[PDB]
């Protein structure tokens, strides 16, 4: 009756250990430009300076 109630607590603590190791993995994982920077306007391509612009200026 007491071995089962200790195995329950050990399972509940190993669950927290797995959760902690997971939530540590999750932060060091790299992340998208749409999640790290603003979601709308998801491309990093600037295309900036649009009045006196030259054709051939893109690459």
């Amino acid at each position: 009756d007491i071995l089962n109630e200790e195995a329950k607590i050990v399972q509940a603590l190993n669950n927290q250990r797995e959760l902690t190791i997971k939530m540590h993995e999750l932060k060091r994982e790299e992340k998208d430009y749409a999640h790290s920077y603003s979601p709308l306007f998801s491309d990093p391509v600037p295309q900036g300076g649009s009045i006196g612009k030259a054709p051939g200026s893109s690459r």
Partner: protein, 469 residues
């Protein structure tokens, strides 16, 4: 909604008389409360560390910065309560704790400039906000101009802030001269390897950091904190610290830096042994801020330091706020009031405080033991979560210097206790007038947070896990 308050407020304050100033502050107090209560549901925007950039990659809004602005509003509610409410209805405390006409103007302009640093993405937003908050601290220091010490302090702070603003400007344009860019979003993990941005980014961080009071250049700020009056200095000690450190923790440009580690070791050393043989309570109280800013210079070396930072920030803010409010309350019991702006100076003046209002000493003891880092209190988990990040990341000598610095700093924290629990010859029995209900409730709230805030650690870690990861 700060902009609304400033725009409304200077319009309203130009038409009020000087009889109305205190009531105006009360209005603004309640205004800021309903910006916390009715508008904080915006935390739902920042699920799973979703980050926005606003005004064309000009400002950056994540949940870190949302927490920082919530903290700054809470502290401004406390400080504006300290100005807008009477301590007692004597003819004494009216000639001591008196707001100027334009004080709350400069308060809200400084809170604006402090928010536009933590919310900042580009370097010219950083610059314009740094100078907005710097001119506001110049004028908040100089607004009680009928005082020799505050005038001299405002002049000193002007020149020493001017140098360290020109150093930030030099570092920004120096960064621009090697990269046609303003963002540190430009850096993106590969450029740092093939480019020597070490000298640039470290000179930027240093010019930002010498305004906090880090160790080679600490004495001018300790003199400004001793020379300003007792209500001004609780605001100008806290706000540039949390704004500039919340900028430099969010932007990780000094990771594993040797210079920041040298100056962090030196900061922990000179703050711990610097305030040992000191007899003025604001001096004693400012070297505490020097050490507790050292503990942040430690986290500047870190990658992914947002738990340890935010926990120790609201820790230090509540403890700081409470220990200044307790020595506001001890002015009623001292046998000697000098110096109308700064009525208690010497720390031996609170000597018989256990025999007059012993629960003020219970208050004091709680917040001092939390400054030391005693485990039932909230300062312990701040120091603990800083250590869990220092040791995880290889800073082993820094750890032992942290421990020795905390042990040395415990001496002059306990010196406050050692003075206040002592025998005094003439003790109070019966006093006719009462301390402010509104304003002693704030001190009791700040204590109950410190003592019983370890309860919610696991709740806070779970809410952390969802909104920042």
């Amino acid at each position: 909604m700060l902009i609304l308050a400033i725009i409304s407020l200077i319009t309203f304050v130009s038409m009020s008389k000087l009889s109305d100033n205190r009531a105006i502050i009360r209005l603004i107090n309640i205004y800021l409360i309903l910006v916390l209560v009715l508008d904080s549901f915006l935390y739902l925007l920042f699920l799973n560390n979703q980050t926005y950039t606003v005004m064309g990659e000009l400002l950056i809004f994540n949940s870190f910065t949302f927490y920082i602005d919530m903290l700054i509003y809470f502290i401004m509610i406390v400080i504006s309560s300290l100005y807008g409410y009477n301590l007692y209805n004597n003819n004494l405390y009216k000639t001591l704790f008196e707001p100027k006409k334009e004080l709350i103007i400069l308060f809200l302009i400084n809170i604006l400039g402090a928010l536009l640093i933590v919310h900042s993405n580009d370097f010219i937003t950083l610059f314009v906000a740094i100078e907005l908050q710097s001119y506001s601290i110049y004028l908040i220091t100089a607004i009680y101009n009928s005082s020799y010490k505050a005038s001299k302090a405002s002049m000193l702070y002007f020149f020493m802030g001017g140098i360290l603003s020109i150093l930030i400007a030099y570092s920004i344009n120096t960064y621009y001269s090697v990269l046609n860019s303003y963002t540190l979003h430009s850096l993106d993990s590969l450029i740092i390897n093939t480019l020597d941005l070490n000298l640039i980014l470290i000179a930027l961080s240093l010019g930002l950091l010498f305004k906090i009071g880090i160790a080679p250049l600490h004495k001018w700020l300790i003199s400004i904190y001793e020379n300003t009056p007792i209500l001004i200095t609780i605001y100008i000690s806290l706000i540039p610290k949390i704004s500039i450190l919340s900028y430099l923790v969010l932007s990780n440009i000094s990771i594993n830096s040797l210079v920041i580690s040298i100056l962090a070791i030196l900061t922990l050393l000179v703050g711990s042994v610097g305030g040992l043989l000191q007899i003025k309570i604001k001096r004693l109280l400012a070297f505490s801020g020097l050490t507790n800013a050292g503990y942040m210079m430690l986290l500047l070396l870190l990658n992914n330091n947002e738990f340890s930072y935010l926990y120790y920030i609201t820790q230090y803010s509540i403890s700081h706020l409470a220990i200044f409010m307790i020595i506001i309350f001890s002015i009623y019991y001292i046998n000697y009031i000098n110096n109308q702006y700064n009525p208690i100076i010497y720390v031996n003046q609170l000597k018989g405080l256990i025999h007059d209002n012993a629960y003020l000493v219970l208050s004091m003891a709680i917040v001092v033991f939390s400054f030391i880092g005693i485990p039932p209190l909230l300062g312990f988990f701040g120091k603990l979560n800083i250590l869990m990040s220092i040791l995880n990341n290889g800073y082993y000598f820094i750890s032992i210097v942290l421990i020795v610095a905390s042990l040395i700093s415990a001496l002059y924290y306990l010196y406050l206790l050692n003075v206040s629990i002592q025998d005094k010859n003439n003790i109070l029995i019966n006093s006719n007038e009462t301390v402010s209900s509104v304003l002693s409730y704030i001190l009791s709230s700040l204590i109950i947070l410190i003592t019983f805030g370890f309860i919610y650690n696991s709740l806070i870690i779970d809410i952390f896990n969802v909104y920042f990861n």
